């Protein structure tokens, strides 16, 4: 309850989506939520210091991360905290004792032995806490003619082509450069006319500002409906390919949800266009996708029936 509600508050669009899906009786909350569903270092004491501010300030800043690190590395601190805090002593009092205890300020053969033993024990605690095909092608010509289909490579006739090959071979054998014959004023005018704006080569031009034809609120609603449709169709195609009877029932439920979504949200949105008489066929894409899904499902039903005939 509280856990699920907090997720909705994190994503208002999801809450809007959840409102459009479950509140509108389009889908159940059960089917809704069916779709929805640190290292340890040795410096945890050396780096951690009592923070002294500019003027007499002990900013201990007792974060859980350091406390958890100490408890994992030192179960003794955990045991003392459990057996004392907050009954025998308060948590801040325990931390002050730890700061002032000789176990923290370890700082003479006995002292050297104590330091060595403490270092060895610390290393042991850290280590313990760390625990918890040759290929050969056949048809190379497939690469020479890949995804390109068979072109219309029309071949010439009999050896007379050679005569034509001779003709150019004789036509350009005695060649003189020409300048006037290269272009003419009529040819230039025709080329400009082809290149003139709005001409045969200049296809199309400026288009209509569809951004102003679609209201921004309608834009946002279209985006939200697109998100909803995409989620529903992702659930629909996720079942595909169908290999078990459960997928058939899930797809039937998804189709029912899509139909209810179209009835509840799409049509008043459609009327919202029709009342505003928007000429943009924004809904046409959504209708095409929905009809494509319907056709795919019905075709698979036909195939399964034929398999059952």
């Amino acid at each position: 309850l509280e856990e699920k509600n907090r997720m909705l508050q994190e994503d208002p669009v999801l809450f809007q989506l959840y409102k459009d899906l479950v509140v509108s009786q389009v889908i159940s909350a059960e089917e809704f939520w069916a779709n929805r569903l640190v290292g340890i270092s040795a410096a945890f004491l050396a780096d951690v210091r009592p923070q002294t501010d500019g003027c007499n300030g002990l900013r201990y800043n007792l974060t859980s991360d350091i406390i958890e690190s100490i408890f994992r590395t030192y179960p003794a601190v955990k045991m003392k905290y459990a057996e004392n805090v907050p009954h025998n002593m308060t948590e801040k009092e325990f931390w002050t004792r730890f700061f002032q205890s000789h176990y923290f300020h370890r700082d003479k053969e006995n002292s050297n032995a104590a330091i060595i033993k403490r270092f060895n024990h610390h290393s042991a605690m850290v280590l313990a806490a760390g625990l918890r095909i040759a290929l050969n092608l056949k048809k190379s010509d497939r690469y020479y003619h890949g995804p390109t289909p068979i072109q219309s490579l029309q071949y010439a006739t009999s050896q007379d082509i050679i005569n034509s090959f001779q003709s150019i071979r004789q036509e350009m054998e005695a060649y003189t450069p020409k300048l006037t014959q290269v272009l003419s004023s009529s040819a230039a005018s025709s080329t400009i006319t082809a290149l003139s704006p709005g001409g045969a080569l200049m296809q199309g031009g400026t288009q209509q500002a569809i951004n102003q034809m679609v209201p921004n609120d309608i834009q946002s609603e279209l985006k939200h409906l697109y998100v909803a449709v995409g989620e529903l169709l992702r659930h629909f195609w996720s079942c595909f390919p169908v290999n078990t009877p459960f997928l058939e029932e899930k797809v039937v439920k998804m189709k029912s949800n899509l139909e209810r979504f179209q009835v509840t949200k799409l049509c008043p949105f459609q009327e919202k266009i029709r009342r505003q008489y928007l000429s943009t066929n924004l809904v046409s894409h959504i209708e095409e996708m929905l009809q494509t899904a319907y056709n795919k499902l019905h075709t698979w039903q036909s195939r399964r029936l034929m398999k059952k005939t």
Partner: protein, 36 residues
């Protein structure tokens, strides 16, 4: 954790207060002995 200079000043203050308290105790004991 106090800075070492502040710790030394605190120790001096504690020592002076303890010495004055001992002096007051001595004066009180002398006064009580005299009264007795």
């Amino acid at each position: 954790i106090e800075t070492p200079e502040q710790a030394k000043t605190r120790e001096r203050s504690e020592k002076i207060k303890l010495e004055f308290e001992t002096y007051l105790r001595r004066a009180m004991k002398r006064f009580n002995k005299g009264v007795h």
